[PDB]
Write a structure and sequence with these properties.
Layout: E1 2-8, H1 18-32, E2 35-44, E3 54-61, H2 65-79, E4 90-95, H3 96-99, H4 103-111, H5 116-126, E5 130-132, H6 138-147, E6 154-160, H7 174-184, E7 192-193, E8 198-199, E9 209-215, H8 218-227, E10 236-241, E11 249-251, E12 262-270, E13 275-277, E14 281-288, E15 291-297, H9 304-310, E16 316-324, E17 327-335, E18 342-345, E19 357-358, E20 365-367, E21 372-374, E22 378-381, E23 389-392, E24 413-414
Parallel strand pairs: 2-10, 11-12, 15-17, 23-24
Antiparallel strand pairs: 1-3, 1-4, 2-3, 4-5, 6-9, 6-10, 7-8, 12-14, 12-16, 13-14, 14-15, 16-17, 17-23, 18-22, 19-20, 20-21
The chain binds magnesium ion (MG) and zinc ion.
The site of magnesium ion has 8 residues, from strand 3.
GO molecular function: ATP binding; ligase activity, forming carbon-nitrogen bonds; nucleic acid binding
Enzyme class: ligase
Subcellular location: Cytoplasm
């Protein structure tokens, strides 16, 4: 029997994660019960809920479901850090035929906020077998990993370390990764920030992941793997993911009001012009269908603040990001229509080229150093530095679910390698 297995909430801010444990589980199943069918899936959920918010599923074929539960159960007891207060493992076991009924659930988990009671209701309703070793908060993610429909998807090859070296500093050749990026980009993407000289695919944490490489094909991913120079790789796995799909984005048309803890694409026109602040942050405001909305480019977006700092009143713009504390964290932005600015100003002297000074209330204008004259004010359309089109935050600040420009089929994209 083909059964989908879902798991979340295994993470300890010290030595275990989500994906690692799912690989172990996969190994055990493969050896005790049956075969894992296809690739496992890594499903990131609402990225606003109080880094790295992702559940995992995989398809297996086994003879008996009750044994499957037990196998996974034991994997959890042995490997998950159950003592850690922020670790409430959940897992579910769903007939292939029944996964489809969970698409809406998954959707809501990715875009919205969910309660445990809902997860439980669904489980009771379909007599879904499940594990909840502590709190059942992890059953939300487990159910979502199983239900999620992936129209668009990307792949990530995740390489894990040898246990012996968990918690220690990683060893790797930096150039290795920049070189790998030159070769394969964009079949691999967002693994390096050229502008900021950062290897993005290598985490900063006491976790089992050595590196994770995002990309479009299995071919490219394994190519990336062979070119890269690191300390030895123990386990390795490719997941189909909802990374880089903007799957979390609720469009303005979809909704009456805006809420915090949700993410949006919405168009507006600038009202309150941009202004820096206290910590290296650049705010502004736009008028929208929902009224006045605060947008923000925080310090960690670096050069992306430069393009934001430009725009002026009335500019038509479309914004992408999460709402926290009633302001939108910009991930991406489109300059749609540039505001036309007219200006009436003093005439430029034709000889010396400097600005003509007034000559009195009705007396027109003059340039005294030449012997020159003119009667009416020069009238120019203001020419601004900001081109229309699309702009995004640099890779070192890309959020997991943020669809990067390179993966969009649009005109006027401004990408800075
Ligand atoms: Mg998680
Ligand atoms: Zn002059």
């Amino acid at each position: 029997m083909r059964v989908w297995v879902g798991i979340d909430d295994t993470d300890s801010s010290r030595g275990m994660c989500t994906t690692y444990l799912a690989v172990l589980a996969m190994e055990r199943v493969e050896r005790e019960l049956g075969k894992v069918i296809g690739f496992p899936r890594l499903i990131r959920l609402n990225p606003t809920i109080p880094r790295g918010n992702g559940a995992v599923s995989f398809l297996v074929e086994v003879d008996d479901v009750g044994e499957l539960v037990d196998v996974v159960n034991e994997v959890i007891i042995e490997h998950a850090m159950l003592d850690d207060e922020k670790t409430n493992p959940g897992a579910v076991f769903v007939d292939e035929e029944l996964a489809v009924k969970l698409k809406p659930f998954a959707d809501k988990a990715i875009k919205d906020v969910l309660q445990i009671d809902e997860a439980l209701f669904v489980i009771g309703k379909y007599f879904i077998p499940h594990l909840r070793h502590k709190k059942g908060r992890g059953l939300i993610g487990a159910l979502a990993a199983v239900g999620a429909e992936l129209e668009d998807f990307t792949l990530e090859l995740i390489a894990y370390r040898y246990p012996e070296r968990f918690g220690t500093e990683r060893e790797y050749d930096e150039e290795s990764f920049f070189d790998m990026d030159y070769e394969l980009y964009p079949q691999t993407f967002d693994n390096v920030d050229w502008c900021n000289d950062v290897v993005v695919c290598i985490p900063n944490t006491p976790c089992p992941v050595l590196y994770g490489i995002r990309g479009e094909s299995v071919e490219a991913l394994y190519k990336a793997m062979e070119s890269v120079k690191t300390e030895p790789v123990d386990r390795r796995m490719i997941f189909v993911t909802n990374h880089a799909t903007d799957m979390h984005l609720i469009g303005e048309e979809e909704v009456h009001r805006l809420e915090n803890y949700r993410s949006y694409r919405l168009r507006g026109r600038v009202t309150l012009e941009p202004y820096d602040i206290e910590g290296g942050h650049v705010f502004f405001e736009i008028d929208t269908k929902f009224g006045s909305v605060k947008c923000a480019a925080f310090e960690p977006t670096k050069q992306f603040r430069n393009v934001i700092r430009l725009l002026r009143k009335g500019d038509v713009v479309e914004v992408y990001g999460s709402m926290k504390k009633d302001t939108i964290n910009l991930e991406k932005i489109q300059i749609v229509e540039l505001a036309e600015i007219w200006v009436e100003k003093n005439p430029i002297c034709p000889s010396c080229g400097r600005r003509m000074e007034s000559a009195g209330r009705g007396q027109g204008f003059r340039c005294k150093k030449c012997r020159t004259k003119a009667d009416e004010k020069l009238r120019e359309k203001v020419e601004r530095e900001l081109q229309p089109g699309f702009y995004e935050v640099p890779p070192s600040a890309r959020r997991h679910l943020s669809k990067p420009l390179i993966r969009m089929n649009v005109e006027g994209r401004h990408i800075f390698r």
